[PDB]
């Protein structure tokens, strides 16, 4: 039915929300991380699962922390969107008896990946593909007030360019 412009590339972007650490709240958080980035194709939220308890002075590795997104767009458009639209990763507290609580948000600057080294790889038909990867730890800032670092998020992202869409 519906085509895309021939100059579109097939990209694969993946986010690994690997761990959280340095909880600065005095109480235990039953943590999930949740995000939406409709540029990748859907506003449907992605979240870690199940919840994991986080207390002070520990690194907790998140389950179901990895997601890869295959999408088609123009290189120019990916550049502008990654420069202008931050990836907002929400820290939620979950409990069986209580309603879900939003504690804070990490703002991930996707364009950090664009300055990383581009490395070559080959696609499933020997075509020239490129990969960039970037890793850092970023602050989760409290949801209601401002500038209050409540947790750190260690993540990795990868961007693969499979070249022109087929």
Author numbering: 447 to 612
What do the paper's sentences say?
Using X-ray crystallography, we show that the ciliopathy-associated centriolar protein CEP120 contains three C2 domains. CEP120, for example, plays a key role in the duplication, elongation, and maturation of centrioles, which in principle could impact the production of a functional basal body (Comartin et al., 2013, Lin et al., 2013, Mahjoub et al., 2010, Wu et al., 2014). All three C2 domains of CEP120 (C2A, C2B, and C2C) adopt the PLC δ1-like topology II and are structurally similar to each other (root-mean-square deviation [RMSD], 2.4–2.6 Å), with major differences found mainly in their loop length. Thus, the CEP120 C2 domains probably play a role as protein-protein interaction modules.
While the linker between C2A and C2B is short, the linker between C2B and C2C is ∼100 residues long and enriched with proline and charged residues but largely non-conserved and without predicted secondary structure elements. Our structures revealed neither complexed Ca2+ nor potential Ca2+-coordinating top loop residues or cationic β-grooves. Prime candidates for interaction interfaces in these domains are the regions defined by strands 3 and 4 at the edges of their β sandwich that constitute their most conserved parts.
